[PDB]
Symmetry: D2
Subunit: 208 residues, 4 copies
């Protein structure tokens, strides 16, 4: 409200470590008067866009950290770019798919994330957390909300609000649920994942 | 005066994109189309200067940029060129860039304008596995994709289909891997060249 | 018969590059009077063992090159060891599975392959074929027939007959049949696979 | 006089198997069992000599050998120790071996005698993903597995459960990867140590 807010999102669930990290960190007080406000987004792009727009409008955040599961990635990553296309390798939770679909007619092909990427990487390394920048978020709902948030902020004169996406590995639950015929997944204990999201949130607000 | 497909690869020790471009130079395709091949240096400033000259002098009806993606198992088509330079390894001048925008006050990205699904279908009909890639890296390969798409748009030639085709290692690239590193997926060069040719034929058939 | 025979096996098929390589190379004449005799084995261990025993007895080969598909491997490989256990990650073609099952009571835990492994690797490299030694054949039917063949040969006083296993990558057909939700496979054109089997066969008989 | 589980790791720069063994030394388990930990050098001849002494002097009721398998995503149990030494990288003495039999007129392999399925189930109950591995490599890790299983059999102690547990990289191992190499799967050291502990408890509960 009157104090600076970092908006932290995860995706609603079988198991989703981004939801668990967002839920645990809701209300976290950070230095400089900053507070974390967490929300879960549905895994369907139209409903996720509508929900994220409401959060951006109602919470008026000073920074936006969107998070999601990237099952198969070994380490936390920061997305460099949100691409203005929807192309689903798997259906969303409404059973729907998109193929080569522009997110918005006559909008940029992409938005670069505006989080302090190198500062977050350095904060992770100081906390003994391996991590890196990713240059594709996929074209599923995760990428969609990154593009949606960056576009909304720019169109409302808030392009200076740092905004980006943080993909997290599988947690133990995700890895344990992999069928026996599929390859084993890299994973992290949920406490490691949540700590990485926290360290990133703290780095973002310290810079901003 | 006849329609030209500009086909580029990167200069080498071994580079399958160079070998494919060299073999396909001068190929005649249906509808009057001819392939004009050129090799680009693996240094972005010189590569950009060389590609601008090719785009200007050859005035191509379509642009197929190719390069090696050592480690990928199958040919891929790049969906998007990103306006950032960020090198994990030096270029051939020993130079690296860090989060560097390619051009001030230019788009963050350009989408490739090749007929992607048409190429994938032509590959599948030719028994060639392949797919669309959604990141070209931020090395010289990505740089020339962004460079070409930007140049075409800025010269009123945005309708010229233009994109990037990454190819696997060939046998030579895989054989040169040191014993301490993991083995690479690879394709015989004849498979790689045939995939480039099939993509070229699909591109000109649409236009 | 009166001339030295290299016994070359592949596995019966959707698509199997080891079957195609074995079928193409049947009857190949090699230097020194050697001829390739090819046969396809079923993908069920009991029937495969019975069929391989008959081939070993009836063909009386001077060398044995067993081959099979290893979908996901990028390059041809030579198996170092056949392990005396059956443990199936997927059912065989009879719908059957085994778990931690010894192949034969009171038999060795393993047999090392007796092919000239380094000579084959060198012949591959001279032919511009990347390849390597593998130290596990899995515990599916492929490993089973390697162990079965090595055991049979030793128990019949023919331990000196060079015998081993050659795994081949997916061919184009195998890679094209992968569902859209699964990761893309390394593959080789069938002509590359068949040539690698041929080069290995030629190296084996030149040494023996 | 009380039953001893011998727990080994390998001496380092960073090795999670060493850290797990050091933390668990002296752990009391139900049924009177105690963990005795030792670190082995990463040179096979010295490692074999050190392990033989531990087996002889500690007379353990079970043997849990552990080591780092940088690149594996989850803890694994080795099914088989192969009687061959073949090093892709030098040991700590700068030495390599090529297709070298570990011992003349000895078995080609020994199967591990740990209760593998019981350990996997204990891991799953503790929310730890894991699996059986069917090759330990042919480096020092495999060497000590074969060495221990052979020594136990040759001293009439084949019934002593004995096996190998490979662990992923920890954070330190993953952070030390150079920028040109691909990122490693990893686990926080506390997860790795807990997996070793759970395996140890499952082993002693069966015996």
């Amino acid at each position: 409200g009157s104090m600076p807010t970092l908006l932290l999102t995860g995706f609603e669930p079988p198991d989703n470590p981004s939801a668990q990290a967002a839920q645990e960190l809701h209300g976290l007080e950070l230095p400089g008067g900053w507070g974390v406000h967490s929300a879960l987004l549905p895994v369907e792009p139209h409903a996720a866009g509508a929900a994220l727009t409401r959060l951006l409008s109602e919470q008026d955040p000073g920074a936006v950290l969107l998070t999601g599961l990237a099952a198969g990635r070994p380490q936390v990553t920061l997305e460099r770019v949100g691409v203005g296309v929807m192309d689903f390798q798997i259906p969303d939770n409404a059973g729907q798919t998109y193929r080569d679909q522009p997110i918005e007619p006559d909008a940029p092909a992409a938005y670069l994330a505006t989080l302090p990427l190198r500062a977050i990487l350095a904060a992770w390394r100081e906390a003994e957390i391996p991590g890196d920048i990713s240059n594709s978020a996929g074209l599923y709902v995760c990428n969609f909300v990154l593009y949606h948030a960056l576009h909304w902020l720019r169109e409302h004169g808030r392009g200076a609000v740092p905004c980006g996406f943080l993909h997290v590995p599988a947690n133990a639950a995700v890895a344990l649920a992999v069928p026996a015929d599929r390859p084993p997944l890299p994973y992290l204990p949920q406490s490691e994942i949540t700590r990485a999201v926290r360290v990133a949130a703290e780095a973002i607000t310290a810079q901003s």
